[PDB]
Design a protein around this ligand. Structure first.
Ligand SMILES: [Mg+2]
Ligand SMILES: [Mg+2]
Length: 466
């Protein structure tokens, strides 16, 4: 009985979903849909599982299919509005929250989401540089503050070590210090090329980490397990420092501090989560407003805009958060020429560097995330050959073992956030490269305990569904 088979497969998918095994959830929903392609609940649950795995494009299409089947399926509208929020389609989301708060005026949840949506809409409408309406010198550190302070405005190794300790005890760096770090670090970054270039001599090493997503206690574990940064232990943090994790302020100010301390050996590349559309939904903007001000947040936003987009080691390995391009013929010079100081556009090379994913089949598809592309091994081979490169290192996707090697070895994924969001139970890893030998060496590690704060504790409700 085809329909009762579809239904058993959907029940298994629900089971997979609840166990946080979205990849199988998706697969069993997909098979359910294969047997009965005309049920709204199926499309709606698969839309939610695509949302959980940040596949906004696919969540959007499934939500739309669910709504086209049943105009009264309320879930369909929330999950459609979530996808659109994450895609920067704020007005589209509001239309759906409206259609809901309409079909029941009473709903507590409906109006809260509508209002939260309108507030972002209203702000973005509204939307000189923030530093100029700040008077950092005039601020005063209260006598009774006993946490870390800069040594005459300067970051040092002793400041970094006390900062790390202070944060471990869940305490807050005085706002004056936070401001100074931000201003200097803006100054450093705004000097960098869009493409950072590093030469590693025969005897030198470099560590590449992937996403860390505000997992502060895991970030300290990287440093214990692999050493503090210094001029003989350089690091690249390949984006997505913040969001989801509820210690994002602690992660980003530690990283920025180390960038000031070892500016030529501690490198930070922009990820898709160093952007407004992500930060307003996924916790960072809320965490910074809770702990500091809306003005601090606007400053973080403007610094993120100067983060370089890619890094090239010895002209042979190319590192970016996302992946390769929607278009053929993009060169390394083209990347160097990108005007990066902005939010990323909806498409184009800057967008692809932050957002794209590899796919196993040849060619290009519109991406499952609803922005940029998926690119096959023939895309990767042509770009490497055209540019005299050996392979790429990228991050952006959660991996069960903390890394993955795709495209015949030409596309490497590294991911540095173990037990991601307290739920995935994945290993994390970092890479060592060596000047004499640029083949990636992987080191895996597991999650470490942290205080009682939930992931997304500071985020609005727009992307917390189910
Ligand atoms: Mg990412
Ligand atoms: Mg990420």
């Amino acid at each position: 009985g085809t329909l009762k088979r579809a239904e058993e497969l959907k029940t298994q998918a629900n089971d997979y979903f609840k166990a946080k095994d979205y990849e199988n959830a998706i697969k069993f929903y997909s098979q359910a849909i294969e047997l009965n392609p005309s049920n709204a609940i199926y499309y709606g649950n698969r839309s939610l599982a695509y949302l959980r795995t940040e596949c906004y494009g696919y969540a959007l299409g499934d939500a739309t299919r669910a709504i086209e089947l049943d105009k009264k399926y309320i879930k369909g509208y929330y999950r459609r509005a979530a996808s659109n929020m994450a895609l920067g389609k704020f007005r589209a989301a509001l239309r759906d929250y409206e259609t809901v708060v309409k079909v029941k005026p009473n709903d507590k949840d409906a109006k809260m989401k509508y209002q939260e949506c309108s507030k972002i809409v209203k702000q973005k409408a509204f939307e000189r540089s923030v530093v100029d309406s700040l008077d950092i010198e005039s601020m005063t550190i209260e006598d009774e503050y006993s946490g870390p302070k800069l040594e005459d405005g300067k970051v040092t190794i002793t400041f970094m070590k006390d900062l790390m300790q202070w944060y471990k005890d869940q305490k807050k760096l005085h706002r004056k210090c936070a401001y100074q770090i931000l201003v200097q670090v803006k100054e450093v970054l705004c000097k960098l090329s869009t493409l950072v270039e590093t030469t590693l001599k025969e005897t030198e090493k470099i560590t590449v980490c992937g996403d860390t997503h505000g997992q502060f206690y895991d970030l300290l574990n990287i440093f214990e397990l692999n050493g503090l940064p210094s001029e003989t232990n350089p690091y690249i943090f390949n984006g997505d420092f913040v969001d989801r994790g509820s210690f994002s302020v602690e992660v980003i100010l530690t990283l920025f501090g180390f960038k000031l301390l070892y500016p030529d050996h501690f490198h930070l590349l922009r990820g898709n989560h160093e952007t407004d559309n992500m930060n307003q939904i996924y916790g960072f903007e809320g965490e910074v407003k809770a702990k500091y001000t809306a003005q601090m947040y606007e400053l973080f936003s403007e610094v993120f805009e100067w983060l370089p987009l890619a890094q090239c080691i010895n002209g042979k390995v190319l590192i970016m958060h996302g992946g390769l391009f929607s278009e053929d013929g993009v060169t390394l010079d083209d990347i160097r020429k990108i005007e990066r100081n902005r939010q990323p556009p909806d498409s184009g090379p800057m967008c692809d560097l932050l957002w794209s994913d590899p796919q196993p089949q040849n060619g290009r598809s519109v991406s499952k995330r609803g922005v940029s592309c998926q690119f096959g091994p023939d895309v990767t081979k042509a770009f490497l050959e055209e540019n005299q490169l050996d392979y790429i290192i990228r991050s952006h996707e959660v991996k069960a073992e903390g890394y993955e090697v795709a495209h015949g070895g030409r596309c490497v994924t590294v991911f540095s956030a173990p037990n991601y969001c307290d739920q995935m139970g994945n290993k994390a890893s970092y890479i060592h490269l060596q000047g004499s030998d640029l083949r990636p060496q992987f080191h895996q590690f597991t999650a470490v305990p942290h205080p009682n704060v939930k992931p997304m504790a500071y985020a609005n409700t727009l992307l917390q569904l189910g």
